[PDB]
């Protein structure tokens, strides 16, 4: 019978495309979401119409807190409830906004959201995934620009760097269990909805390969590769999917 | 008048050596400590005997929490209270222990300690340092083995990777203010008290340059360079002080 | 209308497995070789027996010299001669042996180790670009480039130079629609000269399975990078090392 | 008696500042040069007028060829002939110009000059230095922008990458002899004489720390640090001296 995947933040944009591609590949999927219930439920509806009871939704805040470990355990539990197994975890959900060092949300809340979503929740989901255990693997959505970071995005950038460390540490630790742990690192893919079109076009013009952003599907293609049998010896690797952007000097 | 430095976790081991060498160079120093009050007071005594009114202690827990931003603000305030200025911040304090992914602190506590000390506290101290602002700089104590991490040290490794990101992000953002941000990355220096002698000797035998761990003073020498007028164009750099250890394959 | 690929050092081992997988995917192939003529011709025969007129051999020494640019140009020319096009270049051929700092002269060691691992890939890349669909180059790198084998300075310098080429060429050739990427094995097929005991020592260091990668596993990554599933990927080096590079001393 | 250093390409610019600063620190120096004979001799005259018998000159082409190994042996031998010892080797000499992949010097000459000066000569000098052998070390002049390379500078970038490899491989291999091997990686320092003023200003404006290039002396300061007793545990490290330039995204 069919393998099962959890994709965090799967209601929209890149997470949605990953969930859809995994589903087209034969996976049953847990569509995790936070606020986007309509989009999550609509996606599960689309996938279940394609193949009955091959998709479920699971809501959780992945901000760091006292209850985050239980929340992450329940996400993995929801995959076993629905499908009796959990083969693939994709850590995609991510808060992304500036946190300037020099002078809305308190800074402790910004820490909670940015470090929780990008690092701590992936760590806790990774714990719960492994504890509950074939071709088992984890794919972490990293960032090709982590060493050339956006100005005033220190907490975001810290969370993504921590995610590289988790990818490597978990690859090493989980290898004895046959669980591979890899990353996919977009440069610019779907640009933020709140970005103006002038600013979007400025980023596009920087990308060497085609002067355009990656589609969500091009990002998902790398995830599909990493979870496949064609990546059976790949662990601890982070594949940039950035059209050369990270190679361009200032 | 004499510049001033804050050193976190300065009561013992590497931080103590750092504080000592800063003081020998002419700095006034805030000796931050958490639990090691006797060692901290004793160090301030020794330094004030050498030059009166040039050392104070400052107690703070650097575990993550909603009041960590206030604690970090108060550490920087304590330097201004004692000395009227704060020229150098050294982020040295660090929790270090295993957190296995599979199999009596709660995981919430482990996250708070390891990510708070190694990453979030450095970030909040950097914010407070900058907000309060000559040769101004910050030095982060990193880890040369961050990409070849110890088995079952995921959270620690996550915090140290996050600290690399902070070093880079803050270097970029604080450059306009004339604040340099750099790192020093030991391999093995003073080995942990709790580590057994056999295990210490196994690590020693791995170091190409001398088959021995670094002294705390050797680590301090790199901090002294980075804060000095000889490093005036250096920002965002992490200097390994590892005797070649990170170059050795499995 | 089938695309064509040049694979350097393709007569045996990993280059053979790459050539075979590319052929199985639908490519016509130039099997470049240096000394392994019998193995090269035998491979071309297997492939042509599957699909007529889809494989040719091409001999060349890739040691650095003043005629190396001509040799590299001729390898690319040989793909256009046989197939009328050249879509994919795989830089796989490589000399590998120690060159301690303290029979071959040092001049020869530089020529072979830097030639095969870095300069020939550069010249092949120049000739490939000059003669120009889903065009790409794949360089065979080394996951252990930053934790090098003792006394392999020149080999390691060549593999580091190859990373630089991968990045430099990705940048410069992107406007031509040519993608340039790498595949970095840790331990795969161990050297023929290596003793079984020494092999086992290396196998035991690999976190994922305590074994070396198959040639096919390496080839799989090459196939991904040349495919339409990697159309936005350029300047990326994919480790295929079972976690080996993550293991401390 | 006084230790002795070889500095390649020491007649002008950064190499000259390095030789001067080593000499000021107390070293006797071999000034290697290729075409800049008048400047080389003028420097030797200046240094010797300062302290007698502390500077000599050695001419050689460092282009790759069948005779380069002998030329490199002779450079090292010049230090022994004059001073009876050779404590420090600085690999500074470097060809730097574009070599476009798609369409003066033939390409084989470009390869010889760019890979020879930046990689092969450093390797052969290192062999010669080690074979002839206290605080012994080698410092290689690297490039902070090696991973965000100048368009159409493939062979130069290849040579600098190879030099990183040499730095690491030689640090590992020479550690048992007590020879440290490290690098210094400028971003922009003294800009090329042939670069137009407008283009120079364009580079300066990209540097976060001060919006200007590094003086040669600032580069030399990091060299002095690495050769000093304050760097006794440091080997295989490359210190960026780039004002944050390499952290700046496109
Ligand atoms: N877009 C790019 O160009 C780009 C570039 C580099 C890296 N990446 C990485 O690729 C991944 C996908 O990027 P994206 O642009 O598709 O992401 P996104 O739209 O910014 O965020 C994806 C989802 O994250 C979830 N999320 C945010 N905060 C959360 C919280 N506190 N708790 C739980 N879930 C939360 C949201 O779920 P709801 O909508 O349900 O609230 C959101 O839809 C991210 O990890 C990102 O860092 C993207
Ligand atoms: N030792 C090595 O070989 C090595 C290797 C790589 C990197 N480093 C890095 O170099 C730095 C110094 O190393 P080290 O061995 O000297 O460190 P350490 O002895 O392990 O820790 C230094 C100090 O950190 C403080 N600390 C721990 N938890 C804290 C908390 N919750 N709040 C506030 N302070 C806390 C402690 O202060 P109190 O004693 O006052 O409680 C402790 O004395 C660290 O950042 C470390 O990770 C060291
Ligand atoms: N094997 C591994 O574990 C491993 C690990 C890390 C990286 N890699 C990389 O993966 C690639 C394949 O590895 P491999 O073990 O299959 O390679 P290999 O068997 O050591 O060498 C491959 C071929 O290179 C060709 N070659 C050597 N010197 C040459 C010269 N002067 N001119 C032209 N061709 C020459 C030879 O062709 P003839 O036989 O026709 O003379 C040889 O068959 C290499 O780039 C290697 O560095 C391999
Ligand atoms: N300038 C920068 O911003 C910058 C940036 C990044 C890295 N770096 C690195 O820092 C070092 C010094 O930079 P720089 O700008 O001072 O160097 P440079 O002026 O470009 O060159 C230094 C010297 O290299 C020697 N040289 C060139 N080709 C040679 C050959 N074939 N044989 C022997 N020697 C040769 C020349 O000696 P003669 O004059 O005697 O002929 C020249 O004076 C170089 O390694 C460079 O790559 C510099
Ligand atoms: C454009 C971008 C870079 N990194 C990102 N991370 C998240 N979560 N969302 C985004 O839109 C982006
Ligand atoms: C041995 C070691 C590596 N990293 C460390 N970090 C801290 N805080 N304390 C330590 O003792 C170590
Ligand atoms: C084991 C190995 C690592 N790197 C290699 N490069 C070549 N060419 N051949 C080999 O056998 C290896
Ligand atoms: C500006 C620059 C970057 N890298 C360089 N290398 C050499 N040799 N000379 C230069 O002028 C530069």
Automatic annotation (TrEMBL), chains A, B, D:
UniProt superkingdom: Eukaryota
Residue positions, PTM Cysteine sulfenic acid (-SOH): 58, 72, 150
This protein's record includes keyword Coiled coil: no
Residues the record lists as binding NADPH: 13-14, 34-36, 61-63, 92, 94, 156, 160, 189-190
One annotated GO molecular function: pteridine reductase activity
Protein residues bound to NADP(+): 12-14, 34-36, 61-63, 92, 94, 156, 160, 187, 189-190
List of residues binding substrate: 137
Record-annotated active site: 143 (proton donor/acceptor), 156 (proton donor/acceptor), 156 (proton acceptor)
Keyword annotations from UniProtKB, A to Z: Nucleotide-binding, Oxidoreductase
Pfam families on file: adh_short_C2 (PF13561)
Coiled coil: none
Similarity section: Belongs to the short-chain dehydrogenases/reductases (SDR) family.
Cross-referenced NCBIfam families: pter_reduc_Leis (TIGR02685)
The protein's name in its UniProt record: Pteridine reductase
Provenance organism: Trypanosoma brucei brucei
